[PDB]
């Protein structure tokens, strides 16, 4: 036997050290640990998109909860907040909902007033004032 | 378990040997000894392949021709079967034909 392999145990350990916390014979036998570690790494890679999606769905749930505490629906809050040119994303809106409820009541009052201004503008086509909390700031 | 528990004894090798120091001396003899000898006449090996590279089929054919009149019986039969098998391999099987 010219040059047969000596450091095989270190390759076995290189696969097995990611499988110490498994259940069954997968934490010991190499033939089973390889397939389960491969599936574990593929799940870890595919989980990033699901993490971002699930976090934004959690923020949508918390913002819906706080706005429905204020008698506002979620689409009314998000739409009429973006129509006042305040660009707060869902993360800081949920964090304001949990930790700063006075600022969230101020934001819900702003969204409801811009909603009412839009409704009176729809009945009147303007004429005169196009509201007050309308009139977007123009950048050039 | 495959690995050995204790590391092996230290393998100490003499780099200034008798054989290692004079390696390559009287190589390059034909060029600057006005061509009386070839450097392939410095080779010490089997009588058939002294200055000859060859294949596996070609090595076996040359060994059968140059020496096979004085080989042992079982070795001669094994060489015959090896030449038969290698002809069948190289001239009928493989890719790239």
């Amino acid at each position: 036997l010219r040059n047969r392999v000596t450091d095989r145990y270190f390759r076995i350990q290189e696969v097995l050290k990611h499988a110490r916390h498994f259940r069954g014979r997968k934490n010991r036998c190499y033939r089973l640990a390889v397939r389960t570690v491969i599936r574990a790494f593929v799940k870890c890679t595919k989980a990033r998109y699901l993490k971002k999606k699930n976090m934004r769905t959690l923020w949508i749930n918390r913002i819906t909860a706080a706005s429905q505490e204020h008698g506002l629906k979620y689409p009314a809050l998000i739409g009429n907040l973006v129509k006042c040119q305040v660009e707060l994303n869902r993360k800081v809106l949920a964090d304001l909902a949990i930790y700063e409820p006075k600022t969230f009541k101020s934001l819900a009052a702003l969204a409801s007033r811009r909603r009412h201004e839009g409704f009176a503008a729809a009945l009147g086509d303007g004429k005169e004032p196009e509201g007050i909390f309308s009139r977007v700031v123009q950048y050039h | 378990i495959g690995i050995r528990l204790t590391l092996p004894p230290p393998k100490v090798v003499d780099r200034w040997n008798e054989k290692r120091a004079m390696f390559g001396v009287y190589d390059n003899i034909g060029i600057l000894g006005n061509f009386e000898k070839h450097p392939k006449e410095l080779i010490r090996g089997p009588i058939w392949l002294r200055g000859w590279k060859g294949n596996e089929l070609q090595r076996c054919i040359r060994k059968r021709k140059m020496v096979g009149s004085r080989m042992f019986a079982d070795d001669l039969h094994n060489l015959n079967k090896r030449i038969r098998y290698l002809y069948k391999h190289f001239n009928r099987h493989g890719k790239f034909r």
């Binding site: 000596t6 | 495959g2 590391l7 092996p8």
Partner: peptide, 26 residues
């Protein structure tokens, strides 16, 4: 035996690592 030195030395360093993790010094 399998001939060679580097895998035996690497397993030696792992043995010292495991044995030092079992009985840590003061």
């Amino acid at each position: 035996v399998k001939k060679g030195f580097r895998a035996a030395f690497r397993f030696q360093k792992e043995l010292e690592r495991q044995r030092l993790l079992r009985c840590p010094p003061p």
